[PDB]
Design a protein around this ligand. Structure first.
Ligand SMILES: *[C@@H]1O[C@H](CO)[C@@H](O)[C@H](O)[C@H]1NC(C)=O
Ligand SMILES: [Fe+3]
Ligand SMILES: [Fe+3]
Ligand code: NA
Ligand SMILES: [O-]
Length: 301
């Protein structure tokens, strides 16, 4: 069966004090390496918060080696490409530096704040589009507000331009599977909860244009949510931290939550996505190696 395989990991960005990683980040690096070795991966998606707590200063920042390259260094992961987007902490520093780092590290691919990826499932005519968004420039930086919510964008032109781009791209996308990814959640039951900006501006487009799933991090846990139209919400924000909060449980429409794992003494985890001509599958994997939940999502008509 033709297949495209990828890991989606969020909020993995270590720490700025020595040794520049956490035990959770290392456990996820090892667990991801084991998953790649045993099941395979064509690429890894980062769902943002790549360098805690204030990003990187420029493209030569030692954190690229300390928190990224040296951490994800097990043999099975050498040469697996990453496709990256930014979170709020990245935007407290220099995101242009993370984009420029694409020219330094072969496996790091981050061409602009938001961009389109297209894949053909090998030995099939089935196609996949992934739209990588910058939810910080769209909605604001949550760290700019005492509320730790993205109350408004810093720059109106950047936000309006990205929204227009999303709309145009989603209206034109002909692919068999269409995924959208961004740092902040549409829906989440946890410490930050739903992002009002995305519920208002992005979700109507995901629905109208029959997107398969929206992938995100930002809340430091694992969740699968699904609305009554079958649109999936893959929340994978557990590469470095585990927050057991259910603070926003009642702010998500009843029944949307299908799976949640946030145990405070867990090492975290990630999502593993498999796309075939038959369906898309998502498996949530704890950093201890345990498979926690698996679900499938359909092809677009
Ligand atoms: C951000 O990083 C880029 C790439 O290294 C650099 O050219 C630019 O000067 C940096 N910006 C600031 C404000 O440091
Ligand atoms: Fe985070
Ligand atoms: Fe975040
Ligand atoms: Na390995
Ligand atoms: O986050």
């Amino acid at each position: 069966t033709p297949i495209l395989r990828f890991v989606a990991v969020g909020d993995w960005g270590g720490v700025p004090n020595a040794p520049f990683h956490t035990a959770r980040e290392m456990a996820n690096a090892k667990a991801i390496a084991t998953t790649v070795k045993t099941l395979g991966a064509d690429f890894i998606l980062s769902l943002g918060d790549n360098f805690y707590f204030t990003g990187v200063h420029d493209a030569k920042d030692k954190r690229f080696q300390e928190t990224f390259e040296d951490v994800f260094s097990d043999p099975s992961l050498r040469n697996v490409p990453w496709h990256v987007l930014a979170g709020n902490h990245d935007h407290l520093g220099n995101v242009s530096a993370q984009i420029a780092y694409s020219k330094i590290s072969k496996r790091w691919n981050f061409p602009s704040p938001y961009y389109r990826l297209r894949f053909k499932i090998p030995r099939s005519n089935v196609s996949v589009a992934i739209f990588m968004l910058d939810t910080v420039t769209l909605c604001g930086n949550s760290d700019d507000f005492v509320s730790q919510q993205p109350e408004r964008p810093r720059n109106l032109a950047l936000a309006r331009t990205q929204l227009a781009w999303i709309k145009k791209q989603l209206a034109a996308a002909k692919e068999d599977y269409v995924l959208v990814a961004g740092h902040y959640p549409v829906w989440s039951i946890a410490e930050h909860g739903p992002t009002h900006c995305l519920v208002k501006q992005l979700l109507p487009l995901l629905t109208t244009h029959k997107v398969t799933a929206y992938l995100c991090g930002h809340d430091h846990n694992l969740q699968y949510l699904q609305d009554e139209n079958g649109l999936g919400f893959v929340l994978s924000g557990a590469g470095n931290f585990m927050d057991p909060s259910k603070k926003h449980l009642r702010k998500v429409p009843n029944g949307y939550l299908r799976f949640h794992f946030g145990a405070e003494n867990s090492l975290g985890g990630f999502a593993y996505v498999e796309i075939t001509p038959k369906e898309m599958s998502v498996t949530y994997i704890e950093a201890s190696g345990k498979s926690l939940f698996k679900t499938k999502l359909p092809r677009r008509a």
